[PDB]
Motif scaffolding. Structure first.
Motif, short mmCIF file in Angstrom:
data_model
loop_
_atom_site.label_atom_id
_atom_site.label_comp_id
_atom_site.label_asym_id
_atom_site.label_seq_id
_atom_site.Cartn_x
_atom_site.Cartn_y
_atom_site.Cartn_z
N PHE A 37 28.28 35.80 38.97
CA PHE A 37 29.56 35.48 39.59
C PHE A 37 30.68 35.48 38.56
O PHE A 37 31.76 36.04 38.80
N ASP A 38 30.46 34.83 37.42
CA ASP A 38 31.50 34.75 36.40
C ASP A 38 31.92 36.14 35.94
O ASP A 38 33.11 36.38 35.69
N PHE B 82 34.22 37.36 38.91
CA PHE B 82 35.43 36.58 39.16
C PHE B 82 36.48 36.81 38.09
O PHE B 82 37.67 36.95 38.41
N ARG B 83 36.08 36.86 36.81
CA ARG B 83 37.06 37.00 35.73
C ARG B 83 37.94 38.24 35.87
O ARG B 83 38.97 38.32 35.20
N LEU C 277 25.50 32.26 38.65
CA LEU C 277 26.69 31.93 37.87
C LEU C 277 27.11 33.09 36.97
O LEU C 277 28.28 33.50 36.97
N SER D 69 39.14 37.64 40.35
CA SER D 69 39.88 36.41 40.56
C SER D 69 40.06 36.17 42.06
O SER D 69 39.15 36.43 42.84
N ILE D 70 41.24 35.69 42.47
CA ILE D 70 41.48 35.40 43.87
C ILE D 70 42.36 36.46 44.51
O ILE D 70 42.86 36.24 45.62
N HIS D 71 42.55 37.60 43.84
CA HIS D 71 43.43 38.64 44.33
C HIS D 71 42.71 39.85 44.89
O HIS D 71 43.31 40.61 45.65
N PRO E 178 32.62 26.40 36.37
CA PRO E 178 32.69 26.27 37.83
C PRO E 178 31.56 25.44 38.40
O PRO E 178 30.40 25.53 37.97
#
Ligand SMILES: [Mg+2]
Ligand SMILES: [Mg+2]
Ligand SMILES: [Mg+2]
Ligand SMILES: [Mg+2]
Ligand SMILES: [Mg+2]
Ligand SMILES: [Mg+2]
Ligand SMILES: [Mg+2]
Ligand SMILES: [Mg+2]
Ligand SMILES: [Mg+2]
Ligand SMILES: [Mg+2]
Ligand SMILES: [Mg+2]
Ligand SMILES: [Mg+2]
Ligand SMILES: [Mg+2]
Ligand SMILES: [Mg+2]
Ligand SMILES: [Mg+2]
Ligand SMILES: [Zn+2]
Lengths: 37, 174, 139, 141, 142, 94, 130
Positions: F44-45, F48-49, F41, F52-54, F83
Motif C-alpha cells: 500500500f505504501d 499511496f506515496r 502495508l 495519494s488522494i488524487h 498509517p
RNA sequence: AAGUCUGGGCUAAGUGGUAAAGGAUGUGGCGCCGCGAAGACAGCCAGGAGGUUGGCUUAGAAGCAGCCAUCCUUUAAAGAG
C-alpha cells in the motif's frame, strides 16, 4: 590524541574504526586521531 | 569481494596438514604453524586448499577471510619467504652486523644492538640499509618495526630509520 | 647561464614593467625585459589592452622566444556597453545589454583559442562571459 | 524569544505529560520537519537557540516555520527559600510537546541544507527527535 | 626590535640588510589612549597603524589587567581611539566574605549583608581614584 | 493513469493482529457498500506515496472484483508516524 | 536503464553511415596530445570524425545489432573507434598511424578495421596506408 | 530443598551483576529503495584539458580568503570546482 565522547571524521581523509570497544578515528593528519573516552 | 572463499593454490613442494586448531604449512624454506578457529573447515585436496564457513553470519565471514589469508601467507612464506627493507638517514647514522646481530649507531650516546629471534636473519649490505628476511610474514613485519622504533623518522629533518618506500614528510621549523 | 625552463605563466597585454611576476619567474632568464611591453603591447593593440600571458623559452646563452594572443573575453565586453567591473550581483542584474550578433563580433578575435571554428559555439562562449558580469542577450 | 503578549492568568498548574501529541503531527507548511520523540516542556530559550541555529545555516535563502509556542508559564521559588508562602514567580515560558508533534519545518532549501539545519536544531532540545520529509500522508491529513 | 631577528630566522641566516634614512612619509596612524578606572594614563599613550592598533590595544589592556593593584572595587581597563573604547579588561574586586557566619538558614539574613556590600562597592567605585604603580609601568613597558 | 492494489476482506481479526503482520486495516465504502478490508502495508505504501488522494487506486479483491477507489482518509499513528487505517472510497458514474 | 542508450543509438546512427570504420586505443596521451589526433583526423577527412570514443560493451552491441561483421579485432582495452568512413579516409590512416607512431611511446595504435565491408587486420592496417 | 531436564533462539559484555545526551559497519531478525549483461561497488590504469586569473574585493587572491554570478566548443569525460 583527542579523547572524547563523540568521535567523528574531521576531514574526508579521516577514517572511523572500532577498537577495544571505543570508537576511533585515524587519519594521515595526527591532529584528527581520536579515541572515545 | 570475498577473500575466504577463494581457493588457496598450493604448489608442489609446499604442503598443508590439518590438525586440531591449526594447519601445518611446510615447504622449501621451512615450517610455519597457523592457528585456525575450531568452527572453520580447512579442506586439503589435489593441489588446492579451501576454507569453508558453517554459517554466513558476520563472525563467521570475519573468521573466513582471516583463515584463508593466514594460510596463503604461510604458503608464500615457506615458498618465497618474506623480507622488509629499512633505510637509514642522518648525517652520521650507520648499521653493521656482528652476529648476525644488528648494531645501530643512530645518535644515542651508546650504540644499540638488536638480537634477531629464530628465523628472521639480518642483512646489512650498504651501511645505511638493513634487511629483515624470514619465512614468517608477521615476524618479519614485527622485527622490521622493532628496528624502526629505535629511531623513528624526525618530524623536521630527514633523520632516523625509514621503511623503504616510506615517504619523508617534514613540517617546517623556523 | 641559466637552464632551459619551460615558461608557462600568466601575464597581461599592456600591464608590462619589471614589477613581479616580471622578475621572479623571469629570474631564470636574461632577456630584454621590455619586449612583452614593446612588441606585445603594440602588435596586438588593435583589440585594446588587457590580459594575455606569454610563452617564452630560456636557453642557457640567454635566449628568449615568445608568442601570444588575445585580451580576455571579460575585456572584450568591457568596451561593449561601458563596463569595468561585472554587475556585482548578477543572475537577475541586466546592466549592459547586447544583441545576438553584437555578441557575434567578439569572437572574430578570440576565435583561435578554443576548438570551435563555429562562431555559434564561440558565440555562446563569449556570451557566457556575459552572465558572470550580467550583460544580457536580448530576446 | 517568544512569550504571550497577554495572559488571562499568570500562574498555572503543571499538568501531566501523557499521550501522543494531540495535533501538529503532520508537516503542514514546509518540505522537511523536526518531530519530537519524547514529551517535554521545551523552554523559549531552547526554541530561540534552535531557530537561530537554522537561521545561521540559511544565511541567504530559506523559510523557517516554528510550530510550537511557549504559552505555559514556568514558576520557580526564590533560591534558599523554605517551602510555603505561595506559588513561585514566573521565570519563563515553556511549550508542552508530546511525541509525534512537528515542532519546526523548513522550506525553500536543498535536502542537505534541510536535514543539517534540523540536525543541529535537535541538538539544542532536551529530547530525542526525528527528521521527516513531507509525505503523501501529510497531504491526506 | 623584532625585524633583524626575523630576517635572520626565516632565512637560516643567509639574508642580509642595509638601509639609509630616505626621509619621511604620510601614514594612516591612530592615537590609542589607555585609561584605567576611567582616567587616562598619559604614560601609556602610544600610536600605531589602524591595521594593527586593536591587536596592540587588545594586548596592553590585558597585560595591565594582570599587574594593576586589585582594589576594593572592580577596576576597568580600557583603550580608546579618540573618544571610542575598543578594548576592555576588568580587574577585581577584592571583597569580604560577609556571609562567613551565616549558618542560620534564613535567606533574608544573607541578603541584608549582601545589599550593604553591593551599596558600598558602588560608593568605593565612584570616588575610587586608583593609581598605577611604577612597578606596573615597568611590567607593561618591557 | 490509475494504480492497482490487492485488497482482502477481514472480519473479527484484531486490527492489531493484522497490523502486527504488516497488513494495514481498512474500510471500503460508498453510498451502496461498506466492507471491512485490509491491504498489505508495504504494497500500500508503495502505491499511496504516488497515488495519494488524487489518483484512482483500483482494489484487486480475492473474488475477482476490481473496484475503482479514491483514498478518502488515512489515519496516522501519531507516535510511530505510520498509517493505522485507510478509507477507500468506491467510485461510480455520477 | 537508463541514459546511454541515447549513446547506443548515437553509436548506431553514426555507425549507420560508413563501411570502413576502424578502431584504435586512444588513451595514453595528455590533453595537448589529445586535441592533436582530434583535429588532425578532422583535417585528414570530412566532417569532424576522428574517433567517437564509446563503450566497448556498447560498440560491440552496435557492430552486433547492425550485422556489421562484428569487428571482433580487439574490443578489450581502451577503444575509441576511429570512424574513418564518417570522414573520407583511405591513406588518411597514415595521417593517423604515423602521427601516433611519433609523439610518445606508441601514440595511437590500432587493432580492428573493416575494409569497405570485409574485416581488415592488425598490422595489415598500419601497412594499409604506409 | 528440587532438572547441571528437554526443544529452539539471542548475548561475548562477566553484559547479566546499577545511569543520560551523544558516539558507533558491535551483532541477530524482518521488510523497502537507488544503482548493477548501457556490467555496478572497492582497488589499481588512462584522462582529468579550454573561454578564464569568471566579476568584485584585495598586498596578493588565479576552482581553492571573503564576495555574487556558476555560464561554453573541445568532449568518453572533466565543477566558474
Ligand atoms: Mg563533534
Ligand atoms: Mg590511514
Ligand atoms: Mg526545565
Ligand atoms: Mg514549575
Ligand atoms: Mg512549596
Ligand atoms: Mg514555583
Ligand atoms: Mg537532543
Ligand atoms: Mg551549618
Ligand atoms: Mg514502511
Ligand atoms: Mg541440592
Ligand atoms: Mg543440558
Ligand atoms: Mg541447533
Ligand atoms: Mg558481572
Ligand atoms: Mg556489571
Ligand atoms: Mg545499533
Ligand atoms: Zn582527518
Amino acid at each position: 590524541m583527542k579523547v572524547r565522547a563523540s568521535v567523528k571524521r574531521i576531514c574526508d581523509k579521516c577514517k572511523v574504526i572500532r577498537r577495544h570497544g571505543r570508537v576511533y578515528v585515524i587519519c594521515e593528519n595526527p591532529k584528527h586521531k581520536q579515541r572515545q573516552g | 569481494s570475498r577473500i575466504g572463499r577463494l581457493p588457496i593454490p598450493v604448489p608442489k613442494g609446499v604442503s598443508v596438514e590439518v590438525a586440531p586448531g591449526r594447519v601445518k604449512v611446510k615447504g622449501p624454506k621451512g615450517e610455519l604453524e597457523v592457528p585456525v578457529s575450531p568452527e572453520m573447515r580447512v579442506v586439503v585436496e589435489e593441489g588446492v586448499v579451501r576454507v569453508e564457513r558453517p554459517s554466513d553470519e558476520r563472525r563467521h565471514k570475519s573468521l573466513h577471510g582471516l583463515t584463508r589469508t593466514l594460510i596463503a601467507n604461510a604458503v608464500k612464506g615457506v615458498s618465497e619467504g618474506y623480507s622488509k627493507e629499512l633505510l637509514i638517514k642522518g648525517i652520521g647514522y650507520r648499521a653493521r652486523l656482528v652476529g648476525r646481530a644488528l648494531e645501530l649507531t643512530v645518535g644515542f650516546s651508546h650504540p644499540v644492538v638488536v638480537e634477531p629471534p629464530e628465523g628472521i636473519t639480518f642483512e646489512v649490505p650498504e651501511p645505511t640499509r638493513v634487511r629483515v628476511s624470514g619465512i614468517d610474514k608477521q615476524k618479519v613485519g614485527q622485527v622490521a618495526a622493532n628496528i624502526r622504533a629505535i629511531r623513528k623518522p624526525s618530524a623536521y629533518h630527514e633523520k632516523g630509520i625509514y621503511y623503504a618506500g616510506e615517504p619523508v614528510r617534514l613540517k617546517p621549523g623556523k | 647561464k641559466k637552464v632551459v625552463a619551460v615558461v608557462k605563466l600568466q601575464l597581461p597585454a599592456g600591464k608590462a614593467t619589471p614589477a613581479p611576476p616580471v622578475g621572479p619567474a623571469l629570474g631564470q632568464h636574461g632577456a630584454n625585459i621590455m619586449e612583452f611591453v614593446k612588441a606585445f603591447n603594440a602588435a596586438t593593440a588593435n583589440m585594446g589592452d588587457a590580459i594575455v600571458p606569454v610563452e617564452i623559452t630560456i636557453y642557457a646563452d640567454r635566449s628568449f622566444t615568445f608568442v601570444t594572443k588575445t585580451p580576455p573575453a571579460s575585456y572584450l565586453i568591457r568596451k561593449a556597453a561601458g563596463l569595468e567591473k561585472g554587475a556585482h550581483k548578477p543572475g537577475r542584474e541586466k546592466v549592459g545589454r547586447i544583441t545576438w550578433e553584437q555578441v557575434l563580433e567578439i569572437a572574430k578575435q578570440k576565435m583561435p583559442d578554443l576548438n570551435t571554428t563555429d562562431l555559434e559555439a564561440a558565440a555562446r562562449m563569449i556570451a557566457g562571459s556575459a552572465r558572470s558580469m550580467g550583460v544580457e542577450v536580448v530576446g | 524569544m517568544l512569550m504571550p503578549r497577554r495572559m488571562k492568568y499568570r500562574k498555572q498548574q503543571r499538568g501531566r505529560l501523557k499521550g501522543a501529541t494531540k495535533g501538529g503531527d503532520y508537516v503542514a507548511f514546509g518540505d522537511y520537519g523536526l518531530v519530537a520523540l519524547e514529551p517535554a516542556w521545551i523552554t523559549a530559550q531552547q526554541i530561540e537557540a534552535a531557530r537561530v541555529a537554522m537561521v545561521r545555516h540559511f544565511r541567504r535563502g530559506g523559510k523557517i516555520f516554528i510550530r510550537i509556542f511557549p504559552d505555559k508559564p514556568y514558576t520557580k521559588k526564590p533560591l534558599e527559600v523554605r517551602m510555603g508562602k505561595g506559588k513561585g514567580n514566573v521565570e519563563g515560558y515553556v511549550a508542552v510537546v508530546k511525541p509525534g508533534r512537528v515542532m519546526f519545518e523548513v522550506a525553500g532549501v536543498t535536502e542537505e541544507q534541510a536535514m543539517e539545519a534540523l540536525r543541529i536544531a535537535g541538538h539544542k532540545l532536551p529530547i530525542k527527535t526525528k527528521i521527516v520529509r513531507r509525505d503523501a500522508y501529510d497531504e491526506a491529513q | 626590535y623584532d625585524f633583524h631577528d626575523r630576517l635572520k630566522s626565516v632565512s637560516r641566516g643567509y639574508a642580509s640588510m642595509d638601509y639609509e634614512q630616505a626621509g619621511y612619509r604620510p601614514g594612516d596612524l591612530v592615537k590609542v589612549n589607555v585609561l584605567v578606572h576611567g582616567e587616562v594614563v598619559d604614560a601609556l599613550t602610544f600610536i600605531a597603524h589602524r591595521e594593527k592598533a586593536y591587536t596592540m590595544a587588545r594586548a596592553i589592556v590585558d597585560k595591565l589587567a594582570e599587574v594593576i593593584p586589585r582594589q576594593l572595587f572592580e577596576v576597568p581597563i580600557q583603550a580608546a581611539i579618540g573618544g571610542k573604547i575598543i578594548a576592555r579588561a576588568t580587574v577585581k574586586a577584592l571583597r569580604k566574605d560577609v556571609l562567613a557566619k551565616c549558618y542560620g538558614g534564613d535567606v533574608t539574613r544573607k541578603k541584608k549583608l549582601l545589599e550593604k556590600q553591593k551599596e558600598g562597592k558602588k560608593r568605593l567605585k565612584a570616588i575610587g581614584k586608583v593609581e598605577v604603580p611604577q612597578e606596573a609601568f615597568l611590567a607593561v613597558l618591557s | 493513469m490509475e494504480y492497482r492494489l490487492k485488497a482482502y476482506y477481514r472480519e473479527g481479526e484484531k486490527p492489531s493482529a493484522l497490523r502486527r503482520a504488516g497488513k494495514l486495516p481498512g474500510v471500503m465504502y460508498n453510498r451502496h457498500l461498506n466492507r471491512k478490508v485490509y491491504v498489505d502495508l508495504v504494497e500500500f505504501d508503495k502505491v499511496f506515496r504516488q497515488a495519494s488522494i488524487h489518483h484512482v487506486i483500483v482494489l484487486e479483491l480475492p473474488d475477482g472484483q476490481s473496484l475503482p477507489t479514491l483514498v478518502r482518509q488515512v489515519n496516522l499513528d501519531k507516535r510511530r508516524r505510520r498509517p493505522e487505517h485507510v478509507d477507500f472510497f468506491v467510485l461510480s458514474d455520477e | 536503464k537508463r541514459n546511454v542508450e541515447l549513446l547506443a543509438t548515437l553509436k548506431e546512427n553514426l555507425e549507420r553511415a560508413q563501411g570502413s570504420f576502424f578502431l584504435v586505443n586512444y588513451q595514453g596521451l595528455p590533453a595537448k596530445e589529445t586535441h592533436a589526433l582530434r583535429q588532425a583526423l578532422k583535417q585528414n577527412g570530412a566532417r569532424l570524425f576522428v574517433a567517437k570514443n564509446t563503450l566497448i560493451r556498447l560498440a560491440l552491441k552496435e557492430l552486433g545489432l547492425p550485422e556489421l561483421d562484428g569487428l571482433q579485432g580487439p574490443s578489450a582495452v581502451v577503444f575509441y573507434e576511429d570512424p574513418v568512413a564518417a570522414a573520407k579516409t583511405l591513406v588518411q590512416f597514415a595521417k593517423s598511424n604515423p602521427k601516433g607512431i611519433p609523439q610518445v611511446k606508441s601514440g595511437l595504435l590500432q587493432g580492428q578495421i573493416l575494409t569497405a565491408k570485409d574485416v581488415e587486420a592488425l598490422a595489415e592496417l598500419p601497412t594499409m596506408d604506409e
